[PDB]
Amino acid sequence: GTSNRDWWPNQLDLSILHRHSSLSDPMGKDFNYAQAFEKLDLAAVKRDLHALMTTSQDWWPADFGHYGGLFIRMAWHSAGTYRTADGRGGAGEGQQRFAPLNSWPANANLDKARRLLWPIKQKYGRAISWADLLILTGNVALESMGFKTFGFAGGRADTWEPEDVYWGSEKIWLELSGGPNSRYSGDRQLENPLAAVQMGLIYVNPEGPDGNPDPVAAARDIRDTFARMAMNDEETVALIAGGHTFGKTHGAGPASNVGAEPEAAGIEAQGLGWKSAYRTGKGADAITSGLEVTWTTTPTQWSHNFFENLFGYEWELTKSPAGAHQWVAKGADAVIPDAFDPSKKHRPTMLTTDLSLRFDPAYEKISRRFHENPEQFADAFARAWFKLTHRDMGPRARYLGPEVPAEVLLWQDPIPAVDHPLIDAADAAELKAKVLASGLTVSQLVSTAWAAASTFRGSDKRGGANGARIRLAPQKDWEANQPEQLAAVLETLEAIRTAFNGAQRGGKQVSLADLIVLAGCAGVEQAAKNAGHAVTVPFAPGRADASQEQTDVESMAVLEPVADGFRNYLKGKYRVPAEVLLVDKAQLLTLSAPEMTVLLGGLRVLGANVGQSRHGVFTAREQALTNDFFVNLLDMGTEWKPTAADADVFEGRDRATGELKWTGTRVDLVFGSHSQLRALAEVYGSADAQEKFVRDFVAVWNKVMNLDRFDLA
Amino acid sequence: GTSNRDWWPNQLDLSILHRHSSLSDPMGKDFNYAQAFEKLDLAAVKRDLHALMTTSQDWWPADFGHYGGLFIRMAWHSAGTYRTADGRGGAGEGQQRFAPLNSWPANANLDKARRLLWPIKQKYGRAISWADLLILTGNVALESMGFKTFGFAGGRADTWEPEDVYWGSEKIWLELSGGPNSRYSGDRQLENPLAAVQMGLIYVNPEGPDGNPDPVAAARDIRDTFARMAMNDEETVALIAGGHTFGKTHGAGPASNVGAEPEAAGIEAQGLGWKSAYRTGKGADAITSGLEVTWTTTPTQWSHNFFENLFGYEWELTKSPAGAHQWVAKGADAVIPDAFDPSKKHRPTMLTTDLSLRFDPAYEKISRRFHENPEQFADAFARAWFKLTHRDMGPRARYLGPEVPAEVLLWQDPIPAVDHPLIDAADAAELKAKVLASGLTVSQLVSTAWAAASTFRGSDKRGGANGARIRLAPQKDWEANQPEQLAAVLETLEAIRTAFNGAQRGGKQVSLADLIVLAGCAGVEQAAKNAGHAVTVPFAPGRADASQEQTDVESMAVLEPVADGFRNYLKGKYRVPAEVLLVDKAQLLTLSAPEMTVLLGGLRVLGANVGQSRHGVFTAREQALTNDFFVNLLDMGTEWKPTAADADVFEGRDRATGELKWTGTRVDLVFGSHSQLRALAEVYGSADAQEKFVRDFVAVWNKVMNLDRFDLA
Ligand code: HEM
Ligand code: HEM
Ligand SMILES: [Cl-]
């Protein structure tokens, strides 16, 4: 059946914005997972999980009688898809159970892992999400095997369809670099936003880069991909050596014995895949990655044997029974237990990427430190495991349950607690009047509050206006934020704050974070008044100001907008057309297509464009909140053409005289070209739509101003 | 960006179920189009349309100074995509403005027509939908040119994204038949559910079949396609000759001068397409179809000149300036006006398909009667034009406005008015108790009500339980409906009805249509009580009983279910897997994925299967409303394998003993295989889900019972 995508494969896709509809969600539109989880008997769940560890099922028998390794890999892979560039992937939505991730090569036989969990899932029902369950199971695996975790939070709601994530352009699983859709160019530079070296891998290739078994070059891939997952050297070595203290790999026979991945399998497979024709197809005969490595002398118990082995032997290149490159300890005795036959032992073995931890000079220093000081290794791995599995959870306010660590961590972008009375409605009116009396314009007010709040992304729940990090490094210097203009606004607002706060008693004060948002709201009110309309913009106080020392500057860099169509901004020239970038930004902001439409048309007329650009400013009453953008954009009296200077800038001329009326970018004119966008534009550009436009704009404005407000959730 | 459809192109697609979300809809969730429309000043709209017909715009100058022909074609094409097989296509949702239809070759330059109506759309805003406006404009065109229409109804609500329709499997526009994705097999048999001869055409190829200019063979294609759009020979002749009384075709130069269709055009084209490099690219130089025919001596006035020409001349094969086959009148004078130069006249011309009306012997009889009796032609055309443009609107209750024709037409599947008081809540309770005391079983009651209500399709709003047409031909004899079992149930309910109606005072009575539905309600309550749950199923009275004489039996044929996965029924063997057919049915019933899931699981356990099949009956308490389908399907203790007899039937055996526990079909087991459906199944198969399951099943049941209740809208 030929589809629109087949006929026009490069047309913009709006379906990513209409995901997560109440249509596909089985739960009622009033279901609140947080509340369900808070009533869960978490202790009960953990006791059932501990039991499960050694309750071997015959359709996938437990290695060493203990599923803990398999479950730690499951949990690590759930979290391991995370990319800092967009915040997409990670464990927070349980996406491992949907396509494509349920069928990625690197996720082979994790289908078995999840199926082993169904009875517990079933027993507790909606009070524990799959998303939470996959992480909790990893934690209980660790504790069962003797490692004490740093903590655990619930609160990851399940999702009901696949997220639309860009995982790469290759059309072959696992394709090596340099092909027609290569994710690499130049000197092994991985294209943003990807965080894996091959399509269907988690970070890197366990045999080495494009399968070349060189631990030194593998290290480079490890460092790059782990950094793109928010992990530094110390955390990376802790994670890899900590993980590989447990369990084993599976490569008992040739890979050609393994059949269709789950999304490809027949209906009879009932959601499982990778059925193997090799011997019994499971247990002692399992084939997962094709490698056949067991790292330690006690694979079901926490130990210090990983680094004892890594440093205590020299390593020889060899092949598994499936033909994969791996390493065996020269001259060792058979000290490693077999997973199923007590009469068999094996020599110590390692992956290429394990050896990275010794042969890369920076990892080697850490690895040696961890070898000499195992309590430092344990603590580091505990903290990194917590980080890994909670990285995409958002502000600490979303953390649920009795095991949430009290320690505030820098990577959490912490917001101080509020310890004083908040402003009330009379205070908010007084502040808004002070802001309007200062001279700050509608454009400056809207611009600033937009800059502050629109850093939020729903993918990992980072960013937003809470924290007033816009006044700190690096946000205060981002080009999109207009640093010299922003400085002038902030100085004025900081002076209003100081003067208000100085006049109060009883402890009441206003945060700068709140005042930036309130000032934005005053701008939008003033803009409606310029248009002749009375309007009230909702405002909720309670943001606090974070410090520079609570703001990791390098971690904040990934939130910098290099494209923000809502301010007609593009930092440079990209392969991806700008209207694609606009929809991606709308998805991050959690906007529907109608919300994106109304918001952009109103920001254009309010003066929110970077640099005061006239592109898309289709109004003769700038700073007035009107539907002018849509009425003018849709006027057939104007003809558009690209400029000779720049194919991405368009001039709109009167069709009868030739005279120039407007200029616009691709982001502006896609609203008059895409047949779904134009249908939305028509609604707001109709003669009966002025009040609808204003009301819808205020609602979306407020939505954006509250995106990170999980303290009100 | 590689997608799940790329990796697994044959996996089932659930996205068709979650179209029409409130996410993509810009109107508020309380917007009611009927209420907006009823206050429109329709007369004012029609005056503006009248004025528009002769107000030429220079970017697409009006032929003969009059847009009427263009607008008639626009409206004809809006309606003309309708297929009786599934009810999809048609004018009722305004889909011509979206992909793919907006860029079908047969829709070339209708982009211009729609753009001409923006100023009126803009003026009246949400009070007139685009869907309604396209058809209204065709009517105003006709009236302006001296044709008296049969009437007009408003009430087609706009849609905001493309419908997912199967339009064919060709990957090339206009591909001739006999290609690798040919829609023809055997002796020119067009595959169901298609209703056009080539991808991107409305009915037939105006040059002749696959371009062969033979009017006799063209007539075969005309008859077959028009029959598949619910039109008989008289209506077909009347429509084609009626339409081609007006206007002209456009083929002034070679087709290679025509550029990209709207969906492929540059952003600067602002949603228009087919920009032509031929001379001025428009007006006298226009190219649309490539044919260059003007049918009558007065292209802007109703006449009987089409048949005067068709029959008054002999015809010669010729070529347009674009190279297309067309016909010209042998030895004629230049009597046809030129569209822009009053000093030029042309000989009469015809398409191959126009000549069909004379050279096919059955058409010729009708055409000659219409020639001799033009008043009969005008009445036929007016009736056909109303049917064409309203065929997908649904019951007469949805018809809005002051121009609705009072004559009730047979193709409307009309329902008689109710002229008596309705039963009240106590009456309904008394009747449910009478039904349960009769000895009718849960299975009989559920199955009968299902059979009655589940004929509805939201594509054209035909079917449903209103009418009690289940007791009439042909419904009473459909295989799916289990004719002998059904007859026994109906006899018992008719006796209950008679006894209740006979006891009343005051004119109160219950229709059989209502009692079928209510009795199904009693069955579902009784099933719930069998499971230990007291529930009340909602019921709304007001259905009426239609007569056999008010039921067109041949039109009702297309509503027969040949696949109904909700009753585990497949009338024969199809190319399309049964699960795909299930999702198609769910879409026709307007069900979401969660609604389809709950509905199916509950019907299985209530005994709704055709023929009392055990397939999918995963319960040991049949006729009790429980979640047993889901709990048993999802039990990893059971292993499934296709049977040697039949690859589409599966046995479920205990994994340990081999013992046979169940059998199922693809429709049953897809809920354990597809990753999104299994996630839905898991929610209802959880230990906490019994109350939820009941509540949700009752809700979806009542939704189905009420699909055709636009009297309560
Ligand atoms: C450079 C990064 C890493 C690479 C290339 C890698 C590679 C792999 C491979 C290929 C397997 C074998 C899959 C099989 O055949 O069953 C595996 C097993 C596993 N990995 Fe990793 N790993 C990485 C980092 C991690 C991390 C960060 C963790 C957790 C903190 C982890 C924990 C595990 C464990 C527990 C297993 C054993 C599975 C079982 O016993 O069934 N690894 N690893
Ligand atoms: C066998 C069925 C049909 C065939 C093959 C067909 C073919 C076409 C073609 C090829 C054109 C020219 C497009 C252009 O170049 O501008 C057209 C024009 C037109 N058709 Fe049809 N037609 C059919 C039925 C109908 C029907 C049922 C109606 C309405 C009742 C209709 C009304 C018109 C009108 C009014 C025009 C003139 C458009 C203008 O003046 O711009 N046609 N026909
Ligand atoms: Cl994601």
Ligand SMILES: [Cl-]
């Ligand atoms: Cl449709």
Ligand code: NA
């Ligand atoms: Na994420």
Ligand code: NA
């Ligand atoms: Na339809």
